[model samples]
Target: ATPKKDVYTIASDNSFAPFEFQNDDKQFTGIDVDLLNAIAKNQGFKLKWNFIGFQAAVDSVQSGHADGMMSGMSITDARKQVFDYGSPYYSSNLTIATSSTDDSIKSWKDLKGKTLGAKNGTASFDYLNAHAKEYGYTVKTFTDATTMYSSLNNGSINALMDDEPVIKYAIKQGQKFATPIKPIPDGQYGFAVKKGSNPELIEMFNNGLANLRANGEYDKIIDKYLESDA
Candidate 1:
């Protein structure tokens, strides 16, 4: 095994709620942060977290500026071409959401000729773009969740596509938007290192995740943010 660094720099989004976001005191706290902290403790590793923007998070690791990444990033086959992912840690789906007051959109067909928003470079954006021509909707891209949600709220877009958990978290926290369609199956999320590099870091993350799951710490970290789906 290659010798791993004593401390690694990990990059993530500045504000992807329930996963990674700054709290009232301006400190970063969320499922991803807590889960990684526990894993590092269990694995005897350390991390310097960089709460950069989501796209930058990916770029940071891809450019070798950061050792690894763990924003709420989906593990897609396409991404695997560039990143070596650790074990899948979280599963999420995608959903179409709109302002609660918007009554005209309740289904996919309702989106025809409508403007929709999605975060640039995200799975949701890619999914919507892949099918937009068939659905007959135009897309506007945003760099962060707050701006995306604001666009929907202010009627700049008729709807938005995003990770189901993130939208739910926003609603649960009092955002005035409603998901109109059932979630689309996306994929699992994982910590990632640049392809063919930092294999030991991936190994540490996977082993630590397994141990956290076995000891019940994983469930606790999840429950801290998400309501029981059951």
Candidate 2:
């Protein structure tokens, strides 16, 4: 029998607002954080949490410094070419957010010439950059989600594009000046592992994720942090 691999190291950044972020105690907590822990536990693996910046998470996997990342990355053709993804533990759509008081940009058509902000390396940013004219906006990339939200609330960025649930959670957390703009139908977000590195672990995560959803733990976490605007 083959020996088990040593305890796996995970690189993560909890500064991406509600998807992954630090608590008052500086402990990492959020959807991605909890999901990662669930995967590790269900897989019978130990996790060495190395909290870092978002880009560092990818760098760790690419450089062989860590086993994988669970930083809420999106599945893109370019990313797939470089890194093998797990079986899409969480598939999230992108949405735009803005100030509730603003009415000039009530719709996507109103986004023309607007300063649209998104986190660097996100699918939403890539999608906007790929079809700027179609979306009628100019895309500005922030280093991370917190900065993007800051800009959105301060009016420096007229709108923000990011995961729908994350944006909703942020606004529900009482970001007074920010509100979800609208959703765009596009790609989904997924947890990523290095290309062809861990099949057994992937299967374990997929199963664990399914169980979580089936057993209602998924909705439990979401309802604790999210509120339905409708």
Candidate 3:
């Protein structure tokens, strides 16, 4: 089968660790990176990834600067109005976390007069806004995970909310954060292309994903990055 282009340019978030992040060797790599790379290889297509930061990646896809995005974006009705998505790959929920030593805040009610953060343009950020007033906390928007996490670590924000696996992975990677309460439902993630723009790529991704799951490659990729001690 002939492909639409020789190579497609995909945009991604730079620091969503375990899903996507720069490693010690300074190479951009992670579960999302690996999954997309392997899918491309499996489907006999060529693609390039631009690890430019989350909102930037969304703008890239929206402006046609990039062919697609794999930035751990969840498939929501709001987003569906602007982009088409491939098969859902990962289920996600947002967790509210605090600096490990803090114990005063056990739930949302404890966030009075404090600041809470989330990466901008994310469901986590949207979730924060949805309840900011009732919770009596101020909302802070960040553009990347590094700065967002730093604000949490340095007491700039009393607590931050993010994808649960992301927070768990950061903890596994040595970030001193604690989730004092349970998580809230977010949505499943999928590779995205601008609405009605590049359906073939989505077809190929879903196809390759099915093959990977059938052959155990999907589980292998996930287990490689996650699955630590219970």
Candidate 4:
């Protein structure tokens, strides 16, 4: 039997744990996964997933290879140049990661003289790299968070920085990572979609997202994944 082609294809970077990352069984699961599923069910549309890295996912959506992306991406004005985004579904912050024993990096200001690593093509990297003089720090960019985290773990890098939620999830999973004793708020995280979308799906996602918030579904899902820590 020939199965019907899915009406929508969502590009995602399933490498981000506790959001869209791949599990031991090689299946994708996380908060973004759950929310996207909820949205699809609410809109009565099927979702076909295409997994790619974060930057590549955005590239895929912009190129029309996929209808949208659910990669727990941050919404920024720079991204608006090529694509649009849904309303933020979660709030997060940017923070530094280091070994638990590192006493020198007790504060964000301490990043000076250290090679702080962040994922390339991200706001954190952009912010730090562009304004290195203001922060008195040098930035190291990696292709993905996993690489940065690995560098931090292996002593190849002095520290790694990224979203609070991602760091929290990694630490909770016993990844031997530690915060810099303070965090910087990065505001809410949102999903990015192509500009000039049908407006039908955008409306559906917005309305459905609001409904989920109003009816306690949103809180329940948050509690399910985040609990008090999230």
Candidate 5:
């Protein structure tokens, strides 16, 4: 059996709002933080959190510097080869967003010959990279969501691609962006450990998630940020 550490280190994105982001008090808080804290309490574990950027978060878990990652990370078959994912906690999809005032680009078809900004190391970028040629658009990558949103607002990019919930959260927070096209169904997000590295931790997370769901704590956490959607 792998030795259980005293404190479980969790890697997470710096800013993927409603999931993970710094609040007005400069404290990290969101769905991911709340959910994990609740799970930790249920599982009787202590967590040390690292708010590294998205790609770095994954790398930290892969390098074993962190025991796990939970940064709104999608559970994909490709990722399964490298990490062991716990039960999915949230379902999400991607959306193409443009400056709220920009009427010229209302739909994906309007992106032809335009540039779209997307966060690096995300499913949104993967989707755009694979199909941008078909849509006649080019993609620019950013390490953070704030910069990508700035790129779109400043005319550096005609649009931006990100998970739908993040986009909605940003809009709710007064960011000037609009999702013109319907979101594309992607996949569920899961907490992950390095492949075969922590079976007990994985089981703990999965079982705790079920307990949270059964007790309605999971829905309450999600509903705190999202109105009618999760």
Candidate 6:
């Protein structure tokens, strides 16, 4: 069933690769974008996307400036209280990475006296904050994942804490990053809307996800973005 709105305005990240990133066509389109578009078509709903960066996209939904957000955000209990999430779609893990040339750090224990980095306010950031003391490392939080990754390449930070899919996709795109340690279980990505608002959007997303899966479009979208030999 179509939602009440004439057009659903969705917000998302502008640079979250594999999920959402600007393509060579100078347009923002990735797994999240394509999936949402496919779902909208499958459900017979008209929608618009705004690649307004992650935090702005999130805050826009919270303030009702946007209908929903899909930025590869993980579902967590704390988030559930504020954001009503659609069915969890992509499962992701928090991973640690060092520079491709730096092979000294093979594990968390090797991070002693070193600086670890993460995007502030993310599960990865919280993960680093919680385990810093035990690992004898310090965390340098950044406002953006783009810059946090830059820190890793410049040697300003010895390691980075981010999502496994994101890091791996970036590496495939030639980011000079290396995942040296096993990833920690993180959240499964979900589409979200402000609690008690736009509940129909969640329903639409859930329904659309299943339809895509049954039609084989879901697997095609995922594999098209992620299937690699490495």
How high is each candidate's TM-score?
0.96, 0.84, 0.97, 0.88, 0.95, 0.93
Of the two candidates 3 and 6, the one with more favorable lDDT, higher being better, is 3
Off by over 4 Å in 2: 1-3, 177-182, 214-219, 227-230
Model 1 bad stretches (over 4 Å):
1-3
- Model 4 lDDT on a 0 to 1 scale: 0.76
Which residue pairs does candidate 3 place in steric collision? none
In model 4, what lDDT does residue 189 have?
A: 76
Candidate 6 error regions (>4 Å): 228-230
Candidate 4 residue spans exceeding 4 A from truth: 1-6
Tens digits of lDDT, candidate 1, 1-230: 23368789999998899999998798899999999889988888888999987898999998999999989999999899999999999999999889999889989999999999998789988989998999999999998887888888899999999899899998898989988899999889999999998888888898999999999999999999886979
Candidate 3 at residue 174, lDDT? 94
Sorting all predicted structures by lDDT, with the top scorer first, yields 3, 1, 5, 6, 4, 2
Report the lDDT tens digits of candidate 2 across residue range 26-132: 87787777776876676577777777767878888888888878787877888988677766655577787887778777777888889988776667777778878
lDDT for every model? 0.91, 0.73, 0.91, 0.76, 0.89, 0.88
Q: What lDDT score goes with residue 197 in model 3? A: 91
**Candidate 3: lDDT over CA atoms?**
0.91
lDDT score, candidate 4, position 141:
82
Question: Who wins the TM-score comparison?
Answer: 3
Clash numbers, per candidate: 0, 4, 0, 1, 0, 0
Q: Rank by TM-score, descending?
A: 3, 1, 5, 6, 4, 2
Off by over 4 Å in 3: 228-230
